[PDB]
Amino acid sequence: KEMPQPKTFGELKNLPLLNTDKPVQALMKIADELGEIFKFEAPGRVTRYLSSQRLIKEACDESRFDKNLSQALKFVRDFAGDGLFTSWTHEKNWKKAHNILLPSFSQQAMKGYHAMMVDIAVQLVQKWERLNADEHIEVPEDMTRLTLDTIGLCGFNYRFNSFYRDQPHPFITSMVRALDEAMNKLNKRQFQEDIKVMNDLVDKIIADRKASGEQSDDLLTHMLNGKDPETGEPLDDENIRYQIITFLIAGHETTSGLLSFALYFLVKNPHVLQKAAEEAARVLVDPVPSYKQVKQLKYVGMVLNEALRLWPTAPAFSLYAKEDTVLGGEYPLEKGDELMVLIPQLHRDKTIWGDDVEEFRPERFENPSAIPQHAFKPHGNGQRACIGQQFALHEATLVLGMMLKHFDFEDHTNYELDIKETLTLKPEGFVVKAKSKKIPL
Amino acid sequence: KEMPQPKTFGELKNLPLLNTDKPVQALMKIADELGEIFKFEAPGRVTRYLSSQRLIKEACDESRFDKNLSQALKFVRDFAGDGLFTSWTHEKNWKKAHNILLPSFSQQAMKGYHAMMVDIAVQLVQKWERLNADEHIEVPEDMTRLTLDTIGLCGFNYRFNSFYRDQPHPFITSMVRALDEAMNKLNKRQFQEDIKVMNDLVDKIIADRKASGEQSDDLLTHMLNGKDPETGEPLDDENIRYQIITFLIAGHETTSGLLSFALYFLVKNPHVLQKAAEEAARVLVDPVPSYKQVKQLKYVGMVLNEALRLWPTAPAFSLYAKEDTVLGGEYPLEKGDELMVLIPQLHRDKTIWGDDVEEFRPERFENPSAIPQHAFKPHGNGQRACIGQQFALHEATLVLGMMLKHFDFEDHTNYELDIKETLTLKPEGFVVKAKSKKIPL
Ligand code: HEM
Ligand code: HEM
């Protein structure tokens, strides 16, 4: 009944505990010591961190809890506006965009984004094919180039051309700077400058597109043509711009982090790498992978789910209680009380996953139906779950598959995992050498 | 632009492609091949089958399209007359009966039928309790005994006493024989004899009722006393008779089919059966269920909706274009042109439901507000939607809940699904053994 709580520092409460570069990892160690639920206080605030599937399945009951805008999400709203990621469920533009955009993010819709995803994946592979013997790969850096350019192309048919330069396109520079500043907030002149850089570019392409009348395979075309079935209204130009900025912010680092952690785990587990490589060789028989072929990369998909189990790259999400309620028969909550889902801890619940939780074993995803409800949530929950989940996984499966078809990989530095935390997680400094198998691309 | 259409064979048109007694199942396979819409021609006619949520949302626009009386409904009209189910929207009696009967079919109205529902549900449970050790249950047969008796009792306080008989009451024998003849038309003396059997008994019960002034908790009372708010008129005795026949023909096998498919899906999915049985045990704490308790059977309602998603028991309905119009911006239709809604195919639209559409998963319905509009239509559309929908769902939730409370079920023949098509769908020959939990009534 009494909720555990970590060390307090007078009026600062628990605040000094996340005055660290790695607060989620600090929170996992607190969860290790205190168990499935603890109270966390800051001067004006209170939360409860949840770690067990027991309590989190209740937190995911949408009749009882809804997505909360955490402080991080409120700072990101300064440039992400009322796009899907930073809106209350009850805001009109949340429901409008959700309704219009949902079918355009379905597994079926991936068929239409496939060609441009392939476009950028081929640019990454070709870069690595062109490296000289004396060179290596900076993995998260190249995966972020890849995901930024893919979401740019698929999002609004715009080419950042990240593989053509040392210094990113100025939008990306501003976007990264802006995101950086909002997290550090947990400067102002630069912040305002970088917001303008982003709106100016995105507003222009929207204007350009409406002028030309061109119809493309991108999300922008869907959004200009879409009408909310409920209200019958379309999105206005301003919200369309926030949705575009939102896809980039929410999708670029989560997805490149996934690809990075997956290649990390594969080079640290050569038997798993070989099984994955053998599937990729058998399935991707063409110089350019097809939509259907990506779907047949089942073990690669398990690899990615298992990397998501151990290091879900957007590792915590916030909820509020809709009404007074009791959590797991022991913890009374008041309307509006906040809950944080600590997803990496959820994914380490030995009562669900067995005792070998720290082991990288993709085979645990061999039978999806065998995973109990709400045990695996790297994409959040219910109607506020990641709308980009099919996009992220199709992208990552495509690219990792191509990586394994075309190269052998070496952990030439015997890399020691160092997890950098921002809004997302990634293995900082992860580097590898790739030797080409000289297969037609 | 041009509408897809399967191969034609000279003067036979597409007829050779439907050489089956299971045309909806065959049409679903043609839809898997040709997509969200196709034209289907036979020597006598032309129809267009719609399968996607996006085009069905348009066909559901009542200012553009209205309910069409298909040939089936026109043959049924020979004994169902101008009751709600077989009349055109523009008929005077349609609008009067609609206005008068609606409040008698509301969720609130179910409070008043609840006791009579429980009466027949207890008889079913007792039948099964009283079976000897080596006996088994004929599932559609017993559910149809149940729904016919429940609609008879709730509809005009008449007892068919189906659980006392091998051969049904003569009314039921003539009704189901008339129904069978109407569908086979797609004999004449028997058909006329069955019509007079049906008219005589119902006309006689109506006469007996007004000759006694007796007030009951049934629909006949409601129709004898109600007056259309719009015209101030009441229904006449002949129409009241057609509405009673109509409730029975429209509700008996749709509802019994639902109960049979749900039980099918539970015994083929033991873990789902267990979760539902656990809810039934937790909620049904009294010897007999209350109205309030049936309403709290959330997961049992989810099971029934998921059964309805996969095999909606009245699987297709027909519409006509009210005026010239263009469907989905690509397919021009003329006034009077017919559209068929292929509900099982609609319910397998992967842009809506995900790629996993053949899996039985009740949790799809955990948050009903989060299912897209017009995605789920087992009860038809708008003012011509199933008026019995609350009745059917209260009935099925109550009975399934009691089944799961009082018995364990064994699929002792490893039953192979065989879906018989008539006006409705049912798992023909579905057979089960129950082991009583010995919980007294
Ligand atoms: C492996 C990659 C990804 C992971 C781990 C991830 C994870 C998440 C999580 C945990 C949430 C819920 C946030 C909350 O509850 O506050 C979320 C929401 C969201 N993500 Fe993803 N995401 C990924 C990829 C993407 C991609 C590629 C896109 C865009 C193309 C994207 C767009 C969004 C959007 C728009 C939302 C909000 C949806 C709504 O509430 O309506 N994400 N994501
Ligand atoms: C799960 C069971 C049920 C299913 C799936 C079902 C489904 C349907 C559907 C699809 C329609 C529309 C037909 C069309 O457009 O041509 C319909 C209409 C109708 N149903 Fe139901 N039905 C069910 C139960 C009931 C019950 C229990 C009753 C009667 C007590 C009933 C009475 C009616 C009536 C009279 C109509 C005509 C309504 C009007 O047009 O005004 N149905 N049903």
Short mmCIF file of N, CA and C in Angstrom, two decimals, chain B residues 324-410:
data_model
loop_
_atom_site.label_atom_id
_atom_site.label_comp_id
_atom_site.label_asym_id
_atom_site.label_seq_id
_atom_site.Cartn_x
_atom_site.Cartn_y
_atom_site.Cartn_z
N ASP B 324 -28.12 9.83 -60.16
CA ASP B 324 -26.80 9.71 -60.78
C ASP B 324 -25.74 10.28 -59.84
N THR B 325 -24.60 9.59 -59.80
CA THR B 325 -23.56 10.06 -58.88
C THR B 325 -22.26 9.34 -59.23
N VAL B 326 -21.17 9.76 -58.61
CA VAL B 326 -19.87 9.16 -58.94
C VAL B 326 -19.28 8.62 -57.66
N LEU B 327 -19.03 7.31 -57.65
CA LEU B 327 -18.54 6.68 -56.42
C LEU B 327 -17.03 6.75 -56.31
N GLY B 328 -16.52 7.21 -55.19
CA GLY B 328 -15.09 7.25 -54.93
C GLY B 328 -14.32 8.10 -55.91
N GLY B 329 -15.02 8.94 -56.65
CA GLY B 329 -14.42 9.85 -57.61
C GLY B 329 -14.00 9.19 -58.90
N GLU B 330 -14.29 7.90 -59.08
CA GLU B 330 -13.81 7.19 -60.26
C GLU B 330 -14.89 6.39 -60.97
N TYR B 331 -15.93 6.00 -60.25
CA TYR B 331 -16.95 5.12 -60.81
C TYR B 331 -18.32 5.78 -60.85
N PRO B 332 -18.71 6.20 -62.04
CA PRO B 332 -20.02 6.80 -62.27
C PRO B 332 -21.14 5.77 -62.24
N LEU B 333 -22.18 6.13 -61.50
CA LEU B 333 -23.38 5.30 -61.39
C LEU B 333 -24.59 6.11 -61.84
N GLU B 334 -25.55 5.40 -62.40
CA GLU B 334 -26.83 5.98 -62.78
C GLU B 334 -27.88 5.67 -61.70
N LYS B 335 -28.92 6.48 -61.70
CA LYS B 335 -30.07 6.31 -60.83
C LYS B 335 -30.56 4.87 -60.92
N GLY B 336 -30.72 4.21 -59.78
CA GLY B 336 -31.23 2.85 -59.74
C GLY B 336 -30.18 1.76 -59.74
N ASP B 337 -28.93 2.12 -60.00
CA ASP B 337 -27.83 1.16 -60.03
C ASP B 337 -27.60 0.55 -58.65
N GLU B 338 -27.40 -0.76 -58.64
CA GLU B 338 -27.27 -1.52 -57.40
C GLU B 338 -25.83 -1.78 -56.98
N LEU B 339 -25.62 -1.68 -55.67
CA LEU B 339 -24.42 -1.93 -54.92
C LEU B 339 -24.68 -2.97 -53.82
N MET B 340 -23.79 -3.93 -53.71
CA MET B 340 -23.89 -4.91 -52.62
C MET B 340 -22.73 -4.69 -51.66
N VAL B 341 -23.01 -4.62 -50.37
CA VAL B 341 -21.99 -4.47 -49.35
C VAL B 341 -21.64 -5.88 -48.88
N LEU B 342 -20.39 -6.24 -49.12
CA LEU B 342 -19.86 -7.56 -48.77
C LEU B 342 -19.26 -7.46 -47.39
N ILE B 343 -20.10 -7.57 -46.36
CA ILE B 343 -19.66 -7.27 -45.00
C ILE B 343 -18.49 -8.11 -44.51
N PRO B 344 -18.39 -9.40 -44.76
CA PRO B 344 -17.20 -10.12 -44.25
C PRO B 344 -15.89 -9.60 -44.84
N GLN B 345 -15.94 -9.12 -46.07
CA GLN B 345 -14.78 -8.59 -46.78
C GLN B 345 -14.47 -7.20 -46.23
N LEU B 346 -15.50 -6.38 -46.02
CA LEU B 346 -15.29 -5.09 -45.36
C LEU B 346 -14.52 -5.27 -44.05
N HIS B 347 -14.90 -6.30 -43.30
CA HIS B 347 -14.36 -6.61 -41.99
C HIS B 347 -12.95 -7.21 -42.06
N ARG B 348 -12.44 -7.39 -43.27
CA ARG B 348 -11.08 -7.88 -43.51
C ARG B 348 -10.26 -6.82 -44.24
N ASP B 349 -10.72 -5.57 -44.27
CA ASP B 349 -9.97 -4.47 -44.87
C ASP B 349 -8.71 -4.23 -44.05
N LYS B 350 -7.55 -4.58 -44.60
CA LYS B 350 -6.32 -4.51 -43.79
C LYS B 350 -5.86 -3.08 -43.55
N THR B 351 -6.31 -2.09 -44.32
CA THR B 351 -5.90 -0.71 -44.03
C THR B 351 -6.51 -0.26 -42.71
N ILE B 352 -7.60 -0.91 -42.32
CA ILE B 352 -8.37 -0.64 -41.12
C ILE B 352 -7.94 -1.52 -39.95
N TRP B 353 -7.96 -2.84 -40.18
CA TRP B 353 -7.81 -3.79 -39.10
C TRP B 353 -6.40 -4.33 -38.93
N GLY B 354 -5.47 -3.99 -39.82
CA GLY B 354 -4.14 -4.60 -39.71
C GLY B 354 -4.05 -5.78 -40.65
N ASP B 355 -2.87 -6.38 -40.78
CA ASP B 355 -2.73 -7.41 -41.82
C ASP B 355 -3.25 -8.77 -41.32
N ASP B 356 -3.41 -8.93 -40.02
CA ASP B 356 -3.81 -10.12 -39.31
C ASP B 356 -5.30 -10.44 -39.27
N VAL B 357 -6.05 -10.19 -40.33
CA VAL B 357 -7.51 -10.12 -40.24
C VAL B 357 -8.22 -11.44 -40.04
N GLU B 358 -7.58 -12.58 -40.30
CA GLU B 358 -8.24 -13.87 -40.09
C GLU B 358 -8.11 -14.34 -38.64
N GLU B 359 -7.26 -13.72 -37.84
CA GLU B 359 -7.15 -14.10 -36.44
C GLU B 359 -8.33 -13.60 -35.62
N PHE B 360 -8.77 -14.49 -34.73
CA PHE B 360 -9.80 -14.24 -33.75
C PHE B 360 -9.23 -13.52 -32.54
N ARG B 361 -9.44 -12.20 -32.46
CA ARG B 361 -8.87 -11.46 -31.35
C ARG B 361 -9.85 -10.47 -30.75
N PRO B 362 -10.57 -10.86 -29.70
CA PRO B 362 -11.54 -9.95 -29.09
C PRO B 362 -10.94 -8.61 -28.67
N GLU B 363 -9.67 -8.54 -28.32
CA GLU B 363 -9.12 -7.27 -27.82
C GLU B 363 -9.13 -6.18 -28.88
N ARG B 364 -9.40 -6.49 -30.14
CA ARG B 364 -9.63 -5.48 -31.18
C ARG B 364 -10.72 -4.48 -30.79
N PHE B 365 -11.66 -4.91 -29.96
CA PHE B 365 -12.82 -4.11 -29.59
C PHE B 365 -12.74 -3.57 -28.17
N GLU B 366 -11.55 -3.54 -27.57
CA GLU B 366 -11.41 -3.09 -26.20
C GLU B 366 -11.76 -1.62 -26.00
N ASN B 367 -11.50 -0.81 -27.00
CA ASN B 367 -11.83 0.61 -27.02
C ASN B 367 -12.73 0.88 -28.23
N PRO B 368 -14.05 0.77 -28.09
CA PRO B 368 -14.93 0.91 -29.25
C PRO B 368 -14.89 2.29 -29.87
N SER B 369 -14.64 3.32 -29.05
CA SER B 369 -14.59 4.65 -29.66
C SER B 369 -13.44 4.76 -30.66
N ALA B 370 -12.46 3.87 -30.60
CA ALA B 370 -11.29 3.93 -31.47
C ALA B 370 -11.40 3.03 -32.70
N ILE B 371 -12.60 2.57 -33.06
CA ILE B 371 -12.78 1.85 -34.32
C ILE B 371 -13.26 2.84 -35.37
N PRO B 372 -12.64 2.96 -36.54
CA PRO B 372 -13.07 3.99 -37.50
C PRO B 372 -14.53 3.84 -37.93
N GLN B 373 -15.18 4.99 -38.12
CA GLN B 373 -16.58 5.02 -38.55
C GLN B 373 -16.80 4.20 -39.82
N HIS B 374 -17.89 3.43 -39.84
CA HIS B 374 -18.29 2.57 -40.94
C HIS B 374 -17.37 1.39 -41.21
N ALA B 375 -16.41 1.13 -40.33
CA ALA B 375 -15.52 -0.01 -40.48
C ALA B 375 -16.17 -1.33 -40.07
N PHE B 376 -17.11 -1.24 -39.14
CA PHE B 376 -17.75 -2.44 -38.57
C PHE B 376 -19.25 -2.34 -38.77
N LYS B 377 -19.86 -3.11 -39.65
CA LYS B 377 -21.27 -2.95 -39.98
C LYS B 377 -22.09 -4.22 -40.00
N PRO B 378 -22.01 -5.05 -38.96
CA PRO B 378 -22.74 -6.33 -38.99
C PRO B 378 -24.26 -6.11 -38.89
N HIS B 379 -24.65 -4.92 -38.46
CA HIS B 379 -26.06 -4.58 -38.33
C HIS B 379 -26.55 -3.62 -39.41
N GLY B 380 -25.87 -3.54 -40.55
CA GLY B 380 -26.33 -2.70 -41.65
C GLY B 380 -26.08 -1.22 -41.39
N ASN B 381 -26.86 -0.34 -42.04
CA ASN B 381 -26.54 1.08 -42.01
C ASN B 381 -27.72 2.02 -41.83
N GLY B 382 -27.50 3.06 -41.02
CA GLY B 382 -28.36 4.20 -40.82
C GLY B 382 -29.79 3.89 -40.43
N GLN B 383 -30.75 4.58 -41.04
CA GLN B 383 -32.16 4.34 -40.69
C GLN B 383 -32.65 2.96 -41.09
N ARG B 384 -31.94 2.31 -42.01
CA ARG B 384 -32.29 0.93 -42.38
C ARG B 384 -31.39 -0.08 -41.66
N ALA B 385 -30.75 0.34 -40.58
CA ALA B 385 -29.93 -0.57 -39.79
C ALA B 385 -30.82 -1.55 -39.02
N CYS B 386 -30.22 -2.63 -38.52
CA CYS B 386 -30.93 -3.62 -37.70
C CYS B 386 -31.67 -2.95 -36.54
N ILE B 387 -33.00 -2.97 -36.53
CA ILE B 387 -33.64 -2.39 -35.33
C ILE B 387 -33.48 -3.28 -34.10
N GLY B 388 -33.23 -4.57 -34.36
CA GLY B 388 -33.05 -5.53 -33.28
C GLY B 388 -31.64 -5.58 -32.73
N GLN B 389 -30.76 -4.60 -32.99
CA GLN B 389 -29.35 -4.78 -32.65
C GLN B 389 -29.11 -4.86 -31.15
N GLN B 390 -29.70 -3.98 -30.35
CA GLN B 390 -29.57 -4.04 -28.91
C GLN B 390 -30.17 -5.35 -28.36
N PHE B 391 -31.32 -5.75 -28.88
CA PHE B 391 -31.96 -7.01 -28.49
C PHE B 391 -31.02 -8.19 -28.77
N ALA B 392 -30.48 -8.25 -29.99
CA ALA B 392 -29.61 -9.39 -30.32
C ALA B 392 -28.39 -9.45 -29.41
N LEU B 393 -27.78 -8.29 -29.14
CA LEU B 393 -26.54 -8.28 -28.37
C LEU B 393 -26.81 -8.53 -26.90
N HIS B 394 -27.95 -8.07 -26.38
CA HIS B 394 -28.26 -8.34 -24.98
C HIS B 394 -28.55 -9.83 -24.76
N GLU B 395 -29.34 -10.39 -25.65
CA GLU B 395 -29.62 -11.81 -25.73
C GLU B 395 -28.32 -12.61 -25.85
N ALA B 396 -27.44 -12.29 -26.80
CA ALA B 396 -26.26 -13.15 -26.97
C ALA B 396 -25.29 -13.00 -25.81
N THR B 397 -25.17 -11.80 -25.26
CA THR B 397 -24.25 -11.59 -24.15
C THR B 397 -24.73 -12.35 -22.92
N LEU B 398 -26.02 -12.22 -22.63
CA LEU B 398 -26.62 -12.97 -21.53
C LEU B 398 -26.39 -14.48 -21.65
N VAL B 399 -26.71 -15.06 -22.80
CA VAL B 399 -26.66 -16.52 -22.97
C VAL B 399 -25.22 -17.03 -22.99
N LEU B 400 -24.35 -16.35 -23.75
CA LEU B 400 -22.96 -16.79 -23.78
C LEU B 400 -22.37 -16.70 -22.38
N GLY B 401 -22.72 -15.65 -21.64
CA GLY B 401 -22.20 -15.48 -20.29
C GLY B 401 -22.64 -16.63 -19.39
N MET B 402 -23.91 -17.01 -19.52
CA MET B 402 -24.40 -18.13 -18.71
C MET B 402 -23.77 -19.44 -19.15
N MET B 403 -23.58 -19.68 -20.43
CA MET B 403 -22.88 -20.88 -20.91
C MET B 403 -21.50 -21.04 -20.29
N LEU B 404 -20.72 -19.97 -20.27
CA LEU B 404 -19.36 -19.92 -19.76
C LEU B 404 -19.30 -19.99 -18.23
N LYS B 405 -20.36 -19.51 -17.57
CA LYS B 405 -20.44 -19.67 -16.12
C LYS B 405 -20.71 -21.13 -15.72
N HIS B 406 -21.64 -21.80 -16.39
CA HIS B 406 -22.14 -23.10 -15.95
C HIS B 406 -21.45 -24.30 -16.56
N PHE B 407 -20.71 -24.17 -17.68
CA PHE B 407 -20.10 -25.34 -18.28
C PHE B 407 -18.67 -25.18 -18.80
N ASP B 408 -17.94 -26.29 -18.85
CA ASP B 408 -16.73 -26.36 -19.66
C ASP B 408 -17.09 -27.04 -20.99
N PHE B 409 -16.42 -26.67 -22.06
CA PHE B 409 -16.74 -27.15 -23.39
C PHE B 409 -15.57 -27.89 -24.02
N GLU B 410 -15.92 -28.95 -24.72
CA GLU B 410 -14.96 -29.78 -25.41
C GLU B 410 -15.34 -29.86 -26.88
#
